[PDB]
Motif scaffolding. Structure first.
Motif, PDB file in Angstrom:
ATOM      1  N   UNK A   1       0.705  -1.687  -0.403  1.00 57.25           N
ATOM      2  CA  UNK A   1      -0.082   0.132  -0.185  1.00 57.25           C
ATOM      3  C   UNK A   1       0.826   1.537  -0.217  1.00 57.25           C
ATOM      4  N   UNK A   2       1.043   1.991   1.870  1.00 57.26           N
ATOM      5  CA  UNK A   2       1.661   3.099   0.996  1.00 57.26           C
ATOM      6  C   UNK A   2       3.234   2.689   0.929  1.00 57.26           C
ATOM      7  N   UNK A   3       3.854   1.642   1.348  1.00 61.88           N
ATOM      8  CA  UNK A   3       5.374   1.720   0.776  1.00 61.88           C
ATOM      9  C   UNK A   3       5.646   0.976  -0.667  1.00 61.88           C
ATOM     10  N   UNK A   4       4.479   0.392  -1.548  1.00 60.54           N
ATOM     11  CA  UNK A   4       4.629  -0.274  -2.233  1.00 60.54           C
ATOM     12  C   UNK A   4       5.739   0.223  -3.234  1.00 60.54           C
ATOM     13  N   UNK A   5       6.340   0.899  -3.569  1.00 60.81           N
ATOM     14  CA  UNK A   5       8.162   1.112  -4.799  1.00 60.81           C
ATOM     15  C   UNK A   5       9.118   0.733  -3.794  1.00 60.81           C
ATOM     16  N   UNK A   6       9.064   0.805  -1.976  1.00 60.99           N
ATOM     17  CA  UNK A   6       9.923   0.010  -1.364  1.00 60.99           C
ATOM     18  C   UNK A   6      10.158  -1.631  -1.900  1.00 60.99           C
ATOM     19  N   UNK A   7       8.736  -2.726  -1.779  1.00 58.71           N
ATOM     20  CA  UNK A   7       9.013  -3.716  -2.178  1.00 58.71           C
ATOM     21  C   UNK A   7       9.544  -3.709  -3.550  1.00 58.71           C
ATOM     22  N   UNK A   8       8.825  -2.927  -4.175  1.00 61.08           N
ATOM     23  CA  UNK A   8       9.373  -2.757  -5.748  1.00 61.08           C
ATOM     24  C   UNK A   8      10.902  -2.890  -6.447  1.00 61.08           C
ATOM     25  N   UNK A   9      11.336  -2.084  -5.536  1.00 64.85           N
ATOM     26  CA  UNK A   9      12.472  -1.480  -5.744  1.00 64.85           C
ATOM     27  C   UNK A   9      13.897  -2.876  -4.213  1.00 64.85           C
ATOM     28  N   UNK A  10      13.255  -3.666  -3.422  1.00 59.38           N
ATOM     29  CA  UNK A  10      13.866  -4.370  -2.502  1.00 59.38           C
ATOM     30  C   UNK A  10      14.649  -5.131  -3.803  1.00 59.38           C
ATOM     31  N   UNK A  11      13.170  -5.680  -4.956  1.00 59.39           N
ATOM     32  CA  UNK A  11      13.612  -6.975  -5.821  1.00 59.39           C
ATOM     33  C   UNK A  11      15.440  -6.569  -6.029  1.00 59.39           C
ATOM     34  N   UNK A  12      14.540  -5.340  -6.819  1.00 62.56           N
ATOM     35  CA  UNK A  12      16.147  -4.609  -7.588  1.00 62.56           C
ATOM     36  C   UNK A  12      17.290  -4.852  -7.002  1.00 62.56           C
TER      37      UNK A  12
END
Ligand SMILES: CCCCCCCCCCCCCCCCCC(=O)OC[C@H](COP(=O)(O)OCCN)OC(=O)CCCCCCCCCCCCCCCCC
Ligand SMILES: CCCCCCCCCCCCCCCCCC(=O)OC[C@H](COP(=O)(O)OCCN)OC(=O)CCCCCCCCCCCCCCCCC
Ligand SMILES: CCCCCCCCCCCCCCCCCC(=O)OC[C@H](COP(=O)(O)OCCN)OC(=O)CCCCCCCCCCCCCCCCC
Ligand SMILES: [Cl-]
Lengths: 100, 106, 55, 485, 176
Positions: free
Chosen positions: E135-146
């Motif tokens: 939700x609020x931390x969506x960009x974190x999860x996507x960039x954590x994959x990188x």
């Protein structure tokens, strides 16, 4: 109930112990082990803070922290392998050719 | 409720009895019965890589576990976000398989 | 007495001190990583100490 | 906040570079192709630079609680993308001589660029923490890409261990700040404190532990002992990125943090930052005075240049030119650094083992590589801050911001530091036109890819001179790129 | 809850000290796992059920496994460093220890001066954390994959072997 201060002191003790370990040990393995104690202690502090404020953000930060610890230990142990394969020595004092 | 307190004690006893049972069997083996009076090589980093791959994928699975328990609450937006995450994971897996990093036999 | 421009030699002190200081500072540049880690430890203590005495 | 179609436009640079990382990886999977994979990387990074236009037309907006897209974000995104395209143009000629996997180099440059774009839009402590790691972990492999070289392995081990230690200090500091704040957003750090209560011991301690981590990444005394060793060991193509992308990306997020965070106007933090700046300005130049390795010399130089920039940060809550100064200074530092490090890359390509890092290698560059010597001269004058070069205009801004903020000890340090600096910068410059009869110099490659690197260092030198005499164009652009306050 | 926090908190500090002062590498890792299990109990006592499980699933069940793999692969232990036991020599640890002690004192002082209404312990669930992650931390999860992708690529590049075979001989510069 646990005093927020008690939780933060636990993390600080584990952080300073991990740092002491990273400086007193010449073996690259014990240095990498010391860093894991330091990053785990920082992640523990976030969980304690998030619990004091009743927010999921503390656990969200913990997940980001353990993700870095996993990636950092992966790369860290890979360099340890390369050093061992070529110099058969884990004394970090020997990895000091560049100076001045 | 007494139910949660009862379950707390039951869990603790189960864990204590389980580990105690193992110690009992081990200490029994040591006591029961008589006894007679009486560097150059390394393992390939292929073992490390498997473990390292496991660590990376296991940490990646953590996010999917949190999504699984909250798929309906997250909605379709969450699905689209997870889809991108799973795609990146699969893309990296394809890379590992295609570069041969995932073939035990040379 | 003044044959060697004494006042010029006096104005060359800023440069003699500079070279000397440079060599002393480069003594901390020993390639030893454990020292580099200790350097950050010392820096942290100094920064935190100052922040508390200047709070 | 959620991701609306409008928010998605403001993410174009991050989304395009991310897609490039995936397509390039799937291309390496299909077939390793140094040319195609390098070309795909450059195409994606350029597409992201072009997308900045669409982001600007959309306007400033907070995409999620973690990112705020504004003019500042666009400017620093452009800076990181330019420094990253250059790193790729400088890597191809060098990786041509690397007899091993070379496609992964571009894959790591792309992920590191993603870290800088995140740091540019970062408005939350999580974004700050993640952006630094996204620009650091890829660099561990880039600094140790030639692991077979002893110096490159030593540099990688040193950076990884020290960066890991720095990441723990940063996280622990952020945790202590959270324990007092309760919100991880920059605007909330010091907001709950009452009048005259901003200096809360734990809030200051958290920032202090965060400064250890940030100061390390910015090579600021007393966390600078790593700069000369890593800059020298890292492959030349990588040294260019470490000296430019990482520093600019991390210095920018620090500016946004001290600007948005209420605690930013703490005198204790300001006085501590001031001591670090003074030491960094003096120590960096003094340690570079006797260096005979260009890579180590440029390392110590970075320590002083970042110290000069810190003066503008210390004068942030006193004027408005502070943000403009950093933009103009960092633009000049980018072109000046890409020029000096790029020439070193071209003189170390193709990879043949050790890089051309001794100043003796450059003791007659003009009589072999005329244009490369000319570029190095211009960059050496720019890094020295000599009027007619963009480097001077950056120094002028710093001195102006300092004088308006009555930072007299710091303004005096900039003058003494610049005077000390002139000695080593000029020495390297005049050396290029001396005669070194000894000619162990290797012949230059003859491919358009190598010539492209020569064009990059040439255009960067032309910009340093044109904007050094006429700086209004750049001043106008940087003035448009202002944070969403 | 209180007992769990203090008992697990103490088990952790004691185990951590054994880790930094141990000579045997595997024993040090064992005490490190013990400390991770203790920190997991602290997490559970504070209501962090998700963090609690991850502390054992990823830190003591993956990151540590990797460490043991390396120690067993390179047959670490008994090296001159671990035989000289230099860290035990007082002149080697007194200085570092004092720096760490002063750092702890300054940090604790700042902590003792913070508002403390106390940690209730209300359990924060993994569902709540997942809603925040996606939700609020969506960009974190996507960039954590990188970030993890970067770790995978770098670890493979520097960790891959050039010599084939499950068992390899330690040669200078890994000559093939
Ligand atoms: C026509 C379509 C086809 C062509 C596409 C474009 C081709 C080139 C693409 C690459 C360069 C893109 C740069 C885009 C800059 C202009 C952006 C823009 O829209 O500017 C205006 C914008 C505010 O727009 P708006 O919010 O709509 O205004 C409302 C007013 N009531 O204000 C801003 O956002 C300020 C923008 C300027 C500051 C940031 C600049 C970032 C890019 C440069 C980074 C490097 C800087 C140093 C360069 C040195 C060069 C010597
Ligand atoms: C290696 C060389 C390095 C040189 C570094 C700088 C050296 C000089 C340092 C001077 C320090 C300040 C001395 C004066 C006390 C503090 C300033 C002050 O009281 O006034 C500052 C002045 C007026 O403005 P102010 O009073 O702040 O605002 C209200 C105006 N009605 O506004 C001002 O900004 C004027 C401050 C005084 C003049 C400063 C410029 C001096 C130029 C160099 C001189 C070198 C030789 C001496
Ligand atoms: C040697 C082993 C030492 C282990 C010490 C820690 C465990 C102590 C015994 C269990 C304590 C349980 C307790 O106090 O009650 C459960 C407690 C709170 O449960 P809740 O339902 O929130 O509230 C109930 C009313 N108070 O629950 C909690 O808040 C704590 C939940 C986790 C308890 C510990 C989990 C295992 C830890 C293993 C550590 C191993 C180290 C080596
Ligand atoms: Cl030329």
């Amino acid at each position: 109930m646990i005093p927020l201060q008690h939780g933060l002191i636990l993390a600080a003790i584990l952080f300073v112990l991990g740092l002491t370990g990273l400086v007193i040990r010449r073996n690259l393995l014990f240095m990498l082990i010391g860093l894991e104690i330091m990053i785990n202690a920082s992640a523990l502090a976030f969980v304690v803070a998030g619990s004091y404020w009743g927010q999921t953000d503390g656990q969200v930060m913990y997940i980001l922290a353990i993700s870095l610890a996993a990636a950092e230990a992966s790369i860290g142990l890979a360099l340890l392998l390369q050093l061992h394969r070529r110099r058969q020595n884990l004394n970090i004092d020997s990895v000091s050719e560049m100076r001045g | 409720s007494t139910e949660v307190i009862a379950h707390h004690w039951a869990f603790a006893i189960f864990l204590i009895v389980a580990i105690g049972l193992c110690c009992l069997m081990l200490v029994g083996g040591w006591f029961l019965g008589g006894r007679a009076r009486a560097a150059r090589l390394r393992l390939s980093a292929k073992f490390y890589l498997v473990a390292m791959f496991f660590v990376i994928f296991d940490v990646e699975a953590l996010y999917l576990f949190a999504w699984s328990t909250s798929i309906r609450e997250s909605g379709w937006v969450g699905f689209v976000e997870a889809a991108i995450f799973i795609f990146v994971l699969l893309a990296g897996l394809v890379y590992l398989v295609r570069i041969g990093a995932l073939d035990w036999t040379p | 007495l003044l044959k060697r421009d004494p006042l010029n030699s006096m104005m060359n002190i800023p440069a003699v001190l500079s070279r000397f200081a440079g060599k002393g500072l480069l003594l901390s540049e020993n390639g030893y990583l454990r020292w580099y880690v200790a350097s950050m430890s010392i820096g942290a203590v100094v920064v935190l100490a100052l922040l508390m005495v200047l709070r | 906040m959620t991701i609306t179609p409008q928010n998605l436009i403001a993410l174009l640079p991050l989304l395009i570079v991310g897609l490039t990382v995936v397509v390039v990886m799937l291309s390496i999977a299909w077939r390793r192709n140094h040319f195609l994979n390098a070309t795909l990387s450059v195409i994606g990074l350029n597409a992201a630079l072009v997308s900045l236009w669409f982001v600007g037309q959309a306007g400033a907006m907070d995409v999620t609680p973690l990112m705020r897209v504004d003019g500042f974000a666009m400017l620093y995104t452009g800076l990181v993308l330019l420094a990253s395209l250059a790193t790729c143009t400088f890597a191809y000629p060098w990786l041509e001589g690397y007899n091993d996997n070379k496609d992964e180099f571009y894959l790591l440059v792309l992920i590191a660029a993603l870290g800088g774009i995140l740091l540019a839009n970062a408005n939350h402590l999580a974004s700050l923490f993640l952006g630094i790691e996204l620009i650091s972990l890829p660099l561990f492999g880039l600094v140790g890409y030639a692991f077979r070289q002893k110096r490159s392995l030593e540099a990688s081990i040193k950076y990884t261990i020290l960066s890991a230690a720095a990441s723990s200090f940063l996280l622990f500091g952020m945790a202590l700040v959270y324990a007092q704040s309760g919100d991880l957003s920059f605007v909330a750090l010091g907001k709950n404190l009452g009048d005259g209560m901003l200096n809360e011991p734990l809030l200051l301690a958290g920032f202090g532990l965060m400064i250890v981590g940030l100061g390390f990444k910015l090579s600021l005394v007393p966390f600078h002992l790593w700069t000369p060793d890593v800059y020298q060991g890292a492959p030349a193509p990588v040294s260019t990125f470490l000296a430019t992308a990482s520093k600019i990306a991390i210095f920018g997020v620090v500016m946004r943090l001290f600007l948005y965070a209420p605690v930013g106007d703490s005198e204790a933090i300001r006085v501590v930052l001031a001591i670090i700046a003074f030491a960094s300005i003096i120590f960096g130049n003094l340690m570079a005075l006797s260096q005979t390795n260009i890579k180590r010399l440029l390392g110590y130089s970075s320590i002083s240049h970042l110290g000069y920039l810190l003066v503008a940060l210390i004068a942030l809550q006193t004027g408005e030119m502070s943000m403009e100064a950093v933009g103009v200074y960092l633009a000049g530092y980018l072109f000046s650094s890409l020029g000096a490090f790029g020439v070193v890359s071209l003189m170390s390509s193709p990879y043949r083992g050790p890089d051309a890092d001794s100043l003796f290698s450059y003791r007659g560059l003009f009589w072999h590589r005329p244009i490369l010597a000319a570029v190095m001269t211009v960059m050496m004058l720019s890094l020295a801050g000599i009027p007619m070069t963009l480097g001077f205009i950056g120094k002028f801004y710093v001195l102006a911001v300092g004088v308006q903020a009555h930072l007299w000890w710091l303004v005096g340090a900039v003058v003494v530091g610049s005077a000390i600096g002139l000695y080593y910068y000029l020495r390297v410059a005049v050396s290029l036109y001396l005669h070194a009869p000894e000619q162990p110099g290797r012949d230059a490659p003859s491919n358009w890819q190598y010539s492209a690197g020569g064009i990059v260092v040439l255009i960067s030198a032309l910009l340093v001179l044109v904007l050094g005499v006429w700086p209004q164009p750049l001043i106008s652009i940087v003035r448009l790129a202002m944070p969403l306050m | 809850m209180e007992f769990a926090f203090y008992i697990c908190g103490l088990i952790a500090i004691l185990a951590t000290l054994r880790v930094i002062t141990h000579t045997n590498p595997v024993h040090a890792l064992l005490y490190l796992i013990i400390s991770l299990l203790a920190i997991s109990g602290v997490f559970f006592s504070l209501g962090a059920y998700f963090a609690g499980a991850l502390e054992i699933i990823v830190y003591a069940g993956a990151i540590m496994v990797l460490f043991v793999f390396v120690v067993m692969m390179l047959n670490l232990g008994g090296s001159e460093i671990e035989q000289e036991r230099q860290w035990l020599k007082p002149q080697v640890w007194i200085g570092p220890a004092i720096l760490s002690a002063i750092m702890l004192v300054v940090i604790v002082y700042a902590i003792l001066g913070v508002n403390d209404q106390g940690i209730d312990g209300t359990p924060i669930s993994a569902k709540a954390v997942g809603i925040t992650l996606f939700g609020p931390y969506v960009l974190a999860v996507e960039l954590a994959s990188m970030l993890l992708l970067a770790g995978l690529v770098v670890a493979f590049h520097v960790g891959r072997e050039e010599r084939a075979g499950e068992v390899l001989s330690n040669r200078k510069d890994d000559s093939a």
